[PDB]
């Protein structure tokens, strides 16, 4: 229910509109629970639907990531308790066992923090071999995080984490129009043929 | 010796070590088409959808244009509609409308852009009256033409633009906006000769101008 | 060697061809009738079983070159209707050189909404006034060569949005003509 | 299974294929279990065998050491307990008891950290009286670590720690081709003389 | 007055006080023979193993030296590989196959290098042929010839080399792998006068050239 008074006569600033800002805003990517210690995850943008409308917009970016592990056991109460995130690069072996060679290899950076310090901040740089990353490929990855309790025993602590992504740097080329119908896979653009939703609303008459 | 303050320890998403040192990116190329801000990409003509009728949901490729017939006499109203880009309706279709739905306030001139499709053998005129915000909608054609008008006729030309002075919003689940009403009126009959279809299409084009501008952030 | 006739030009992204078998390819007339739906093309596929430009690329490994699209409509003065002819880089579904026809031209047949198209460089054909629309199109890629079997830069959009109208009694079958010339063409095979 | 497309056709940069990357990053050496309370362990580059080949490459190599102690229960958790890291130099006595005079002395170097801070961190220079290491002796060591709980009582949690090793300012001489067959034994380069794998592996023909 | 951070107290392995400050290390001296980077180690030729069958692990030995018989007629192929450092085959045995697998992206140009060991009263003509990458293993020497090649003959000379103008990789269980095809082709049969032996032998080298980089790194 729309109004008419308290009208604006003076224009805002046009730096906030900026390419930067309108990323600059870290938001969570995904949610990793653990009751097998691997969890091992796939870092990506065409997860959470409301990134991958945003970022769908362009065809060729080009960006870092930020991120951030919040950490707690379920119920929110945090014990003492070591951790370790592993991150493969696009082209190292993927663990497969909690106690196989990948988690003591060398050429894989990782982090070791107990829960009671701050979470833990890693900052990942743009690894792909071209010069931007593609949304759309019409022919015919960024790495992968490993989270384990340190120990040969096995904790007897439930393990929840949430991981959130900041955006820094960010280069954008060829705008395309923006998507307006719903999702069904993560890979394809794909779409329900059986009916097609209309871009804006309707009403009685056009006079109306 | 320090001592910390209030407010460490503390993780603000609006708020870091390199992961690998030794690392060298791929140096850029060069790519055509840069975008260094969102506004140029509002200021592009898209195409309005305002024949957004009940019974047009079934065959959606009817919506981008409105009729003008034969059948019509002198006078009487086409279509009406207001310049909301943020509110649903027919600015819902454009990327100003799609893009706006993204930050909560914006102030600034729009233009709208309207074409005839109809054959070359026909002629006639049109009256394009835009109603300043606070007023109501124009009771007929000698009322909205004492208003701000520009006849536009398609004899000679086949299109016609026309600017709107100034709009604005606060979105609050109400919005503080103050917009005009854009009708179009039959100044004189479609007229047409032998051989020629009696019945033709407008197509209404909308952008932003140089001086728009948006405000605080926000997610659809 | 081949010569066209011609009486406004689109750059898209305001930039030439430029370097990091030169002639005018005319293709097939796509017959536009009161029930068509759309046609589009895939580049550099349209050109790859073609003459010497479709021998050459065949062979050499990497490619990279320009384009020069123009696209002609023949109507008399008392057929009416409109087209929006606009290029798309990587345009991903949801053909060859004879093109294909759009089954959903309100999505674009991939989900996106045909109203905002406009956005690409794009160019209004429309049979009040004029029969005419060429657009430039630089190489756009993230790489400087690439190989043309498998990747397909951009597509090429024909989209009768306003339908095409006519009194019986006059031909029903209006032609749709396009041509095709590249510009910076570049092999290393 | 390879493929042909998606060519790359820049060149990288050359500074990162240098010696100091090469073994810039830091992995772990040795683990450490305590279930008598010296564990006195003997720094080595001849232990986990995928850096006794990545640096036997060369033959005479000098560099300094960056050591990083992270303990914890074997079951990840953490519990508040005092430890002492002990250093014995190349020449100086070993402790043989938990309360020999050696964990009093003063010309051994040592630190002192309970669980809960985070891990210890200690760089030990260049200590061979020659110009360099060498791994190829023709003719006929670094240190002493030793870890104790401190505390004339017995300790009721069991110790488990890992030691990570980092390498800095490294330098190389006289390049060896590598070695391409089964480790024996830590001192000396033996092999298995009943068998003799290939370096390379097989196939049908010749032309095929 | 200042507040922590998120990012502390954490042990990052890719990212100290000195244990004994008194300490003086022995300085160093002058050692012929140092190196300053990994490329100078594979700008070396090496001997590549390209008669790799099955039969021959037992006595690997004879695994660096590929047969030249006189019982061979004119126009048969002799042997045949690619060029593909990175993965498994004859480039395995050499420093360049060896230090590939230690880094994930790498690219440049080769070099191979032929050497007859013969004896001095003996003459033919040999064929060597390098198909570009994407294409196939040529069919017979007329197809072979008309692409790159170089017609290498040991009556006068004993060596020839061949340079491979671009290779690149891409490991990702699969790599994107750009590389051609190397055909050795029996240009004239061997021939001889009496007393010399009848078989003789070639020995394959291989190195980078000076534009060779590699990138990220692994572990093998």
Known sequence: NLIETRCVLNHHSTQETAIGNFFSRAGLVSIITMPDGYVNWDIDLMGYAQL???????????????????????????????????????????????????????????????????????????????????????????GTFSIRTVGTEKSPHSITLRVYMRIKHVRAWIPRPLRNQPYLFKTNPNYKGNDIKCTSTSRDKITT | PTELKPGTNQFLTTDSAPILPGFHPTPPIHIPGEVHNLLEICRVETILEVNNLKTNETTPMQRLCFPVSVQSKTGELCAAFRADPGRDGPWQSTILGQLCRYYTQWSGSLEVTFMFAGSFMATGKMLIAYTPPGGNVPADRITAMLGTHVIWDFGLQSSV????????????????????????????????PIGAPTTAYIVALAAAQDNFTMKLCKDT | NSTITTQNIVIAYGEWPEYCVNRFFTLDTKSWAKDSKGWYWKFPDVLTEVGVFGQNAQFHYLYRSGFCVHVQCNASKFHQGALLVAVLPEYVLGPGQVGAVLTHPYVLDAGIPLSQLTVCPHQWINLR??????????????????????????????????????????????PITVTIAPMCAEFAG
């Open chain 1, 52 to 142: 991958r409308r945003k970022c769908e917009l362009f065809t060729y970016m080009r960006f870092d990531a930020e991120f951030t592990f919040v950490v707690a056991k379920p119920n929110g109460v945090l014990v003492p308790q070591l951790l370790q995130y592993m991150y493969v690069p696009p082209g190292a072996p993927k663990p497969t066992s909690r106690d196989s060679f990948a988690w003591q290899t060398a050429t894989n950076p990782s982090v070791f923090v107990k829960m009671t310090d701050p979470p833990a901040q890693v900052s990942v740089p743009f690894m792909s071999p071209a010069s931007a990353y593609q949304w759309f490929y019409d022919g015919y990855m960024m």
């Open chain 2, 161 to 192: 633009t026309l600017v709107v002075p100034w709009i604005s919003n606060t979105h609050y689940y109400f919005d503080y906006y103050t917009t005009g009403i854009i009708t179009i009126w039959y100044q004189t009959n479609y007229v047409v």
């Open chain 3, 129 to 174: 006034t004029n029969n005419c629309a060429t657009i430039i199109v630089p190489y756009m890629n993230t790489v400087p060569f690439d190989s043309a079997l498998n990747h397909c830069n951009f597509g090429l959009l024909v989209i009768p949005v306003v339908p095409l109208d006519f009194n019986a009694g006059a031909t029903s079958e209006i």
